[PDB]
Design a protein around this ligand. Structure first.
Ligand code: PAR
Ligand code: PAR
Ligand code: MG
Ligand code: MG
Lengths: 130, 178, 68, 154, 227, 197
RNA sequence: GAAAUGAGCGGAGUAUUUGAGCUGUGCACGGCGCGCACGCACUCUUCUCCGUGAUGCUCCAUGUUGGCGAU
RNA sequence: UGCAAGGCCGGAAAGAAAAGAAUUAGAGGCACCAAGUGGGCCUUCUUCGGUAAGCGGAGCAGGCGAUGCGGAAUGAACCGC
RNA sequence: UAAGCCCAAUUAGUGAUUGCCCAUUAUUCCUUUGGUAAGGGCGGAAACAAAGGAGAAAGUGUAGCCCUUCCGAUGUAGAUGUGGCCUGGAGGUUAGGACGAAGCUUAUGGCGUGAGCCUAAGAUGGACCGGCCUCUAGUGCAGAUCUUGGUUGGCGU
């Protein structure tokens, strides 16, 4: 398949909303925690500070969730889950799960060329010829 | 500089009341930037002289007065101004300008410099072009000499905004930068 | 120790957030209890006639329906 | 006001006007107050009996009670966030009949003056034209407003 | 297809009915806007005649005092006292550079005196009204703010059979008429741009050398830099 | 930038969906949300909006109450017309205190086992709202009723109970406990049973 | 150009009726104890008409000219 | 036969004219349940004690508290927003 | 011969408008999100093989049933909502794993506003475990002179 197309992917922000002042502390994760500090410069929204996640940063819903190939991603675990993506084929792409073994990925990658269903993590070498 | 004040003739009147069925119509000469200022200086003077308000008020006319031929005249701008100390000082102040509305504008520019008085603290009375033989101060009377002949010394000849430069070449009309 | 005694500062701004709720009309809560009593006992004699007139008028409005 | 009694701060308020002293007049006794009427509570010292409190002195409300020498009257008092209706009871000298609805009973009876001249007759007083229209001014007198020199010497 | 044929045979009638109502309202807006233009041009000639008949015999023509004011708000929403703040709500001036047409009677002037540091008002011309109604005039249709695009949408809004086009609204606004209130309460408050070229001083009256207060028809050149 | 001061206080609480977990109320909300928009009848507007309401706000009606208000409308009904279909969005309970009742046709959201019997034994009929969407689908010749919310215990406890005028009931598991001070004139005061307004 | 709703894209013509002039006759206006600066009533300048529902509920797909790109 | 009261019956009703003759981003009226707070502080103006105070205490409003942003080089509170 | 003070202009007695520089303001154009939100469509119109395409759910809330339109949006203390995220166990269902599960590692990208989720590579591991709906609780750390273990600069002082 070739993906269905739409307008260009805008992505209001590509920078991660990381935590305030996490770089100075090896404990602190980069996952966002909201400041409740009463004198916090990020919370009080100063000029030179990090931004905070907000409803305005949300993504264009016509183009939301689609990967850079042009496909939404549906995680599959075996061969019978390719059969859901037959009509929904130029919209969704298969993502073979990590715990699926190397033996069962042959059966999935053979039929996903037969049945013409894009896998996001499989048979990219073979899809390049045909 | 084609002056900043205009000669408004504001005509107005109190109102047809039933106390006063036909009221008195008043004429008023004012030098104002525009007619909205000129109408309000008129109702300032209707209040402080005639007990008339603008609410119970008619402006019958507020029209500009065109000037004259441009001729060098001598103007007596009999002018008064308010300061907090020594309030309501009145001076006479003969001037030398081409028009009557420009003569009052000069009076507002040196009541502002010699005495630091602003627009609303100045009332202007009886601007008239007087002849040469009535001018009393010699700093205005020195221009009635029929053979004046002064030189323009100590000048500031600047370039013409299209050919101005930053670095010219010291004996030369070039422009090495700009 | 010492503090601030009495202030009326925020209160008029607090009183107008949910409004000054205005007075209610003169047909609501117009109880005549506590009024001058000889005229209160008289008006009870009249309302006990106006109720049986209202019982008779509605009963007379039904016989002017079962015949028409 | 350092004391919070009933008549506190009522020095000038419960006083009588200059050369207006004396006991109340006979046209106050004969003035008959009826239930449902707008009266106007104004406390009358020289009675000093059945006076309203000092709050109810410019106030005006509806009579709800008439007793032999008393008038109940419903007066709105705003408290915090609400306007509750206080039913005070005074002596009859501390109420005046209110002329608040005088200008409404005037244009009501003008609407039975009109409609008694339109449906039956035709004679009407003419409608009044506005003085704000643009007429011509015939100047019977003109002056010059000029701020003379002699206006400053005073 | 037995049900679907009767629907498109009824849709066929509603197409020729909107095509008739479009050209019927095109004529009675072409005809009614000609009537008003004769009044705007002819009554303007009448006062040029009366002011010459006045001036020839030494008399004066007292012009009619203006009945319509245009009122724009020139200061923002901060630090406003509750008497001044309520009048700015009752004039529908809740944001900076909102503009409303009001009548110029005694109830409205005594509301405009109370909020002068926040507003700049004056007397509009015919072109100031029709530039505000055409370019920036919107309507309150279904509780929503929709822009005037055709005279059918105006006629659907007012339902008055006297206000059928966009020249009816500039008529009732410019010359007060019986329906000044319904036209202006019909529209949303006009939201203008800031003036190009600037403002001289927001904080002082127009007579003091600034911007607020009354401009005795000078408000047209100030709004002509905003519309 | 807009001076919208009292604009959140103009908002009200509407709740377009139901909180119920019943799959048969959700089918009537499927049916009457269809009829509310696709019909100009004010019946289906009110029947849809009253079906969303909570179980406390769907207070039940008694069968002797249906039998009295249907009587007082059949007094001034011409007897060529039959009678309306009584419809309550809520429960019909039986009334012991009213033995004989006419043949009325009642549509309720649930009937008792005994309110169902005394309707059909009087020659009547218990309907349901899918069955009312077929006969009178817009509510022609109906009589929409509610059921009483005053007289509840909770409504009788709403109030202060010790400010003047209030005759609400105190929250007390012991009845003879809160009866002394502030409730008898001999025990220093008794709250005034009446206050104007 | 995947419904181009136009004084603009089309058809169909030589005119349409907007102003400016110059005006008639009543009224209104301006002076008196006849004027009307052409207000209200009934030759110059300009393009004027009719056109196409959705049998499309929604979304997405169609230029030109180079540069790069040969597994 | 008047008066006061509560009803009943019929009438009229610019739904409020004209005189500057209102306006409204005007859904009105009820009720339940319960947080946090109950140290405030600054300012134009009015003001009290004080020699005074970046002092103490009040009045009307607006602010900071709780809020940045654009300006006054810097400044919780000023100017603009 | 101000880059100072007081007045005044806007390209200058030339013939009329607004010298120009800067905002989380204003106008307008996009996108998001929420409404006391407001309207429309949802009986598959006909027709169409491979060698013009897919969707269309009567719907609080989703990867929102699909479109069109309008308005609002910051906030401490606080309240609330969330087919909002995350952890241990239980009831059901649907699947993974010696062709490599859990765990660990990261210049492994992807996408979600975000909490987070998922893929890839380990020249890591060596046997268990995921997703969804419900049920349950010893369920989320950055600080308590926090507890216990280890480490570190001072310092080869
Ligand atoms: O029952 C009383 C009521 O609780 C009380 N508010 C008031 O009603 C006012 C009315 O006030 C609105 O009532 C709404 C809720 O009761 C309220 O709306 C707002 O409430 C908040 C939370 N309750 C917010 O969540 C939200 O901003 C908004 N819904 C009030 O706006 C006024 O609007 C009326 N003008 C007057 C009523 N008296 O009095 C009731 C009497 O018991
Ligand atoms: N009076 C006319 C009729 O009143 C009916 O309502 C009447 C009664 O049904 C109703 O009485 C209810 C009672 O049903 C319910 N079970 C208990 C409730 N407390 C009572 O309410 C009444 O009674 C108490 C008695 O002190 C009063 O204090 C209270 O003010 C009053 N609401 O209140 C009215 C009694 O005067 C209906 N509204 C209607 O049929 C009709 O209008
Ligand atoms: Mg918080
Ligand atoms: Mg724990």
């Amino acid at each position: 398949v070739k993906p269905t197309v739409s307008k260009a992917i805008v992505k209001k922000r590509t920078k991660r909303f990381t935590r305030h002042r996490y770089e100075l502390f090896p404990q602190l994760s980069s996952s966002w925690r909201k400041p409740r500090g009463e004198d916090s410069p990020v919370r009080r929204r100063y000029k030179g500070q990090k931004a905070m996640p907000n409803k305005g940063y949300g993504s264009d819903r016509a183009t939301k969730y689609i990967t850079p190939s042009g496909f939404r991603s549906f995680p599959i675990n075996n061969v019978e889950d390719l059969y859901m993506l037959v009509m929904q084929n130029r919209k969704y792409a298969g993502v073979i799960s990590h715990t699926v073994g190397a033996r069962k990925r042959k059966a999935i990658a053979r039929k996903a060329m037969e049945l013409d269903v894009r896998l996001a993590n499989g048979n990219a070498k073979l899809r390049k010829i045909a | 500089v084609k002056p900043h004040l205009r000669h408004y003739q504001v005509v107005g009147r109190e109102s047809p009341s039933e106390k006063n069925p036909e009221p008195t119509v008043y004429k008023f000469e004012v030098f104002a930037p525009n007619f909205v200022v000129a109408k309000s200086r008129f109702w300032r003077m209707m209040r402080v002289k005639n007990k008339v308000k603008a609410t119970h008020g008619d402006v019958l006319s507020c029209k500009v007065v065109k000037d004259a031929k441009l001729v060098a005249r001598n103007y007596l701008v009999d002018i008064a101004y308010y300061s907090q100390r020594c309030g309501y000082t009145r001076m006479v102040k003969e001037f030398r300008d081409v028009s009557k509305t420009g003569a009052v504008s000069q009076a507002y520019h040196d009541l502002a410099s010699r005495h630091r008085a602003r627009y609303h603290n100045i009332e202007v009375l009886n601007v008239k072009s007087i002849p040469d033989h009535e001018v009393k101060h010699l700093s205005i009377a020195q221009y009635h000499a029929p053979n004046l002949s002064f030189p323009l010394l100590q000048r500031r000849i600047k370039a013409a905004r299209k050919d101005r430069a930053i670095f010219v070449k010291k004996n030369t009309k070039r422009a090495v930068v700009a | 120790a010492k503090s601030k005694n009495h202030t009326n500062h925020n209160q008029s701004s607090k009183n107008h957030r949910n409004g000054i709720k205005g007075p209610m009309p003169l047909h609501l809560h117009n109880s005549k209890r506590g009024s001058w009593l000889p005229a209160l006992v008289n008006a009870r004699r009249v309302r006990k006639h106006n109720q049986k007139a209202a019982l008779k008028k509605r009963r007379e409005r039904i016989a002017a329906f079962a015949a028409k | 006001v350092h004391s919070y009694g009933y008549k506190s701060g009522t020095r000038h308020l419960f006083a009588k006007k200059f050369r207006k002293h004396g006991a109340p007049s006979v046209s106050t006794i004969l003035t008959n107050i009826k239930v449902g009427d707008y009266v106007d509570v104004v406390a009358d010292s020289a009675v000093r009996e059945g006076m309203p409190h000092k709050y109810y002195h410019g106030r005006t409300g509806i009579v709800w009670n008439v007793t032999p020498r008393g008038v109940g009257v419903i007066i709105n008092k705003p408290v915090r966030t609400r306007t509750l209706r206080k039913r005070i009871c005074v002596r009859f000298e501390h109420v005046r009949k209110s002329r608040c609805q005088e200008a409404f009973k005037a244009k009501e009876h003008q609407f039975q003056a009109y409609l008694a001249a339109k449906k039956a007759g035709k004679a009407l007083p003419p409608l009044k034209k506005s003085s704000r229209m643009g007429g011509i001014v015939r100047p019977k007198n003109v002056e010059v407003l000029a701020r003379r020199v002699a206006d400053y010497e005073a | 297809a037995a049900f679907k044929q009767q629907q498109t045979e009824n849709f066929k009638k509603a197409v020729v009915a909107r095509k008739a109502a479009k050209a019927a309202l095109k004529k009675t807006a072409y005809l009614r806007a000609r009537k008003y233009s004769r009044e705007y041009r002819g009554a303007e000639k009448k006062l040029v005649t009366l002011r010459r008949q006045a001036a020839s015999h030494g008399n004066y023509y007292l012009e009619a005092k203006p009945k319509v004011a245009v009122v724009t708000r020139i200061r923002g929403i901060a630090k406003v006292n509750p008497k001044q703040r309520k009048i700015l709500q009752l004039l529908r001036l809740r944001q900076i550079f909102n503009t409303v047409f009001v009548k110029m009677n005694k109830p409205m002037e005594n509301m405009l005196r109370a909020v002068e540091p926040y507003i700049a008002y004056g007397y509009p011309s015919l072109a100031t009204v029709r530039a505000m109604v055409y370019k920036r005039g919107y309507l309150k249709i279904n509780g929503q703010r929709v822009k005037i695009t055709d005279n059918q949408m105006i006629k659907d809004k007012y339902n008055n059979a006297d206000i059928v086009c966009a020249e009816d609204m500039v008529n009732q606004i410019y010359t007060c008429g019986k329906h000044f209130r319904t036209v202006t309460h019909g529209m949303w408050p006009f939201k203008l741009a800031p003036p190009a070229g600037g403002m001289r001083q927001k904080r002082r009256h127009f007579v003091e050398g600034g911007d607020y207060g009354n401009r005795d028809t000078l408000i047209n050149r100030f709004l002509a830099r905003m519309i | 930038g807009v001076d919208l001061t009292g604009i959140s206080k103009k908002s009200r609480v509407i709740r377009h969906h139901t909180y119920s977990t019943n799959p048969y109320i959700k089918l009537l909300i499927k049916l009457y949300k269809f009829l509310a928009k696709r019909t100009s009848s004010g019946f289906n507007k009110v029947v849809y909006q009253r079906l969303i309401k909570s179980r406390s706000n769907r207070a039940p009606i008694s069968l002797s109450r249906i039998a009295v208000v249907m009587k007082r409308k059949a007094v001034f009904t011409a007897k060529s017309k039959a009678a309306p279909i009584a419809v309550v969005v809520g429960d019909v309970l039986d009334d012991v205190r009213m033995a004989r009742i006419p043949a009325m046709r009642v549509c309720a959201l649930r009937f008792s086992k005994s309110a169902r019997q005394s309707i059909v034994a009087a020659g009547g009929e218990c309907l349901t709202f899918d069955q009312l969407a077929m006969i009178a689908p817009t509510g022609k010749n109906t009589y929409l009723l509610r059921g009483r919310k005053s007289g509840r215990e909770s409504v009788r406890h709403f109030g202060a109970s010790g400010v003047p005028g209030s005759h609400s009931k105190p929250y007390a598991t012991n009845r003879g406990k809160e009866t002394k001070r502030g409730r008898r004139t001999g025990r220093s005061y008794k709250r005034k049973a009446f206050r104007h307004v």
